[PDB]
Design a protein around this ligand. Structure first.
Ligand SMILES: CCCCCCCC/C=C\CCCCCCCC(=O)O[C@H](COC(=O)CCCCCCC/C=C/CCCCCCCC)COP(=O)(O)OCC[N+](C)(C)C
Ligand SMILES: *[C@@H]1O[C@H](CO)[C@@H](O[C@@H]2O[C@H](CO)[C@@H](O)[C@H](O)[C@H]2NC(C)=O)[C@H](O)[C@H]1NC(C)=O
Ligand SMILES: CCCCCCCCCCCCCCCCCC(=O)O
Ligand SMILES: CCCCCCCCCCCCCCCC(=O)O
Ligand SMILES: CCCCCCCCCCCCCCCC(=O)O
Ligand SMILES: *[C@@H]1O[C@H](CO)[C@@H](O)[C@H](O)[C@H]1NC(C)=O
Lengths: 53, 438
């Protein structure tokens, strides 16, 4: 079966000099994930429940 | 025509391979990677899923006695209990107060939806790479798919193309692979027949159509309470559900080189690592003669503006003199910059513009238009955005030109120091010569 799931709002990104800062506004616990595209990735995990930076 | 080239294993980047054929006008070719797939070989070890504890109704031998019977059943338990006095709603089930036995029997069976809900343990080895390549040269523009090894040739407009084997044997999958639906995990699953209760692999089955099932769930049987028919038993919970709610993230979230892991079949796509050697077999029909190709002379290169950004932030103005209009092939013989266009319109005005991408402050790349030669020198600038959503279109060369301002100052300092050192050497040499003279 297929279930309708909510889509989170696009985070607000301010570009720093090889820095990346995002505003996170979740209505509910939301999973944020990123990894590096190079030889040695550094994956991340955190469940976001409030506004964080 | 025999020609070999090496291209990066990057999707969305068009390599420009240039053929200098002797008797014909030069031709520049578009090598575009549309998408790759690293395809490992999977050896299924066993199938793991939730189990099912089947507890039939207990036989209660009213004023009598039975013995336990062994059964060829996985994780089978059979305990007889004497002295039982059960009760029902209407009253006492058996007749004698203490002369009674109850037969407790329980076992583990494959769940009804292992056919649906299960995880497969695999071994991955000998990953086979297959890539999608677009060839567009001259007047043709075609796309074909070929296995990336020195043993596959695909026809492209009469041409024999063979992409020789992946530069590196790197793979994102480990020896042991566990696949659940669309997720792949690098997990050391326990060997077959050595599973522990409460962990992944507590029950193991070789195949979905397997008849033999291994179960190690530490099933235990205990006395029923007085006046109750309930078949007490304490058993370890399923390790499959424990793994499901302790699996975490899959290989898609930790794969290096930006690999995208998919299943059906298990594969890693668009990994950006290594080089793809290319062997080319171009016939005569594709090339053009120099008698019909324009003759380009007096080519100078002057540069108005250049920025060493990820995109083609360099702008090059070329001046030349031709006899007839037509189409030249343009190439950069230096990795410092890469020209965006491979063939431009050649007309009478004798001036053409080019877009190039560089990464160095003072690039020195060389541009050839048809058979002409010239040197392009520029001062590129640090760009505007700290972050862009597209990859770099250059080769990431940051060494400045031998004649750049920084290298100019370095060379001036070195020349002055060397002049002083050679003057001192000459003075000492002359002095020593005079000393041995006297
Ligand atoms: C009078 C001063 C003499 C003292 C010099 C002492 C040298 C320093 C020793 C150790 C430094 C450790 C760092 C590694 C070096 C990386 C270089 C490299 O790797 O060069 C690479 C290749 O170069 C060559 O092919 C050789 C050409 C240069 C070598 C000799 C040039 C003659 C003199 C040198 C000028 C520079 C020094 C003087 C300037 C300072 C004056 C104020 C640069 O090409 P690339 O973009 O691929 O590099 C970027 C790396 N990428 C893209 C892979 C990330
Ligand atoms: C040869 O053809 C391909 C496939 O049609 C061209 O790719 C298209 O490029 C245009 C822009 O001109 C895009 O709008 C299309 O979406 C692309 N089609 C795809 C990706 O399926 C490609 O530019 C051509 N290359 C040449 C002319 O050398
Ligand atoms: C690059 C230019 C080459 C010209 C070299 C010029 C030579 C310098 C002129 C005077 C040199 C004399 C130094 C030797 C010391 C004399 C006293 C002695 O020998 O006892
Ligand atoms: C790099 C500048 C030019 C190179 C020539 C520099 C001249 C240096 C002066 C010469 C040294 C003086 C001569 C006598 C030295 C001695 O024998 O004690
Ligand atoms: C690099 C330091 C010196 C090594 C190279 C030696 C080769 C050159 C020969 C030295 C000069 C010999 C000529 C006689 C003059 C003298 O005795 O000083
Ligand atoms: C990734 O892979 C598929 C097939 O290998 C390809 O069609 C797709 O365009 C690729 N995505 C990217 C990064 O362009």
């Amino acid at each position: 079966s297929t279930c309708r799931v909510p889509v989170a709002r696009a985070p607000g990104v301010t570009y720093g000099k090889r820095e990346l800062t995002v505003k996170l506004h979740p209505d509910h616990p939301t999973l944020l994930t990123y990894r590096s595209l190079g030889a040695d990735p550094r994956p991340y995990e955190e469940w976001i429940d409030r506004y964080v930076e | 025509y025999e020609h070999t080239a090496t291209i990066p294993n990057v999707v969305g980047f068009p390599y420009k391979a240039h053929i200098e054929r002797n008797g014909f006008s030069p031709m520049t070719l578009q090598l575009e990677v549309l998408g790759t797939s690293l395809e490992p070989t999977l050896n299924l070890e066993y199938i793991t899923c939730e189990y099912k504890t089947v507890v039939p109704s207990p036989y209660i031998k009213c004023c009598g006695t039975s013995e336990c019977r062994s059964m060829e059943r996985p994780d089978y338990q059979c305990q007889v209990y004497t002295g039982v006095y059960p009760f029902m709603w209407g009253g006492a089930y058996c007749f004698c107060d203490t002369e009674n036995t109850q037969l407790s029997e329980a076992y583990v069976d494959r769940s009804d939806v292992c056919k649906h809900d299960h995880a497969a343990a695999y071994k991955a080895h000998t990953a086979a790479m297959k890539a999608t390549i677009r060839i567009s040269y001259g007047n043709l523009n075609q796309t074909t798919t070929a296995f990336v090894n020195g043993e596959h040739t695909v026809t492209v407009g009469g041409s024999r193309f063979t992409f020789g084997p992946i530069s590196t044997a790197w793979t994102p999958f480990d020896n042991k692979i566990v696949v659940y639906k669309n997720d792949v995990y690098n997990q050391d699953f326990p060997p077959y027949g050595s599973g522990q209760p409460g962990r992944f692999g507590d029950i193991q089955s070789r195949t979905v159509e397997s008849k033999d099932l291994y179960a190690n769930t530490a099933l235990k049987l205990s006395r029923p309470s007085s006046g109750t028919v309930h078949v007490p038993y304490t058993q370890t919970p399923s390790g499959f559900k424990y793994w499901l709610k302790e699996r975490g993230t899959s290989l898609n979230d930790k794969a290096p080189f930006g690999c995208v892991i998919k299943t059906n079949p298990v594969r890693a796509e668009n990994c950006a690592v290594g080089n793809i050697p290319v062997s080319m077999d171009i016939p005569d029909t594709a090339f053009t003669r120099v008698i019909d190709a324009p003759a380009v002379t007096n080519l100078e290169c002057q540069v108005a503006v250049c920025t060493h950004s990820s995109d083609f932030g360099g702008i090059a103005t070329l001046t030349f003199k031709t006899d007839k209009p037509g189409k030249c092939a343009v190439h950069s013989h230096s990795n410092v910059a890469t020209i965006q266009e491979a063939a431009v319109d050649i007309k009478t005005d004798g001036k053409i513009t080019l877009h190039f991408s560089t990464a160095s402050a003072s690039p020195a790349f060389k541009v050839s238009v048809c058979s002409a030669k010239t040197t392009c020198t520029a001062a590129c600038e640090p760009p505007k955005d700290h972050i862009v959503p597209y990859g770099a279109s250059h080769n990431n060369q940051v060494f400045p030109d031998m004649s750049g301002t920084a290298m100019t100052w370095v060379q001036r300092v070195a020349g002055g120091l060397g002049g002083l050192t050679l003057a001192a050497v000459a003075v000492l040499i002359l002095v020593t010569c005079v000393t041995m003279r006297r």
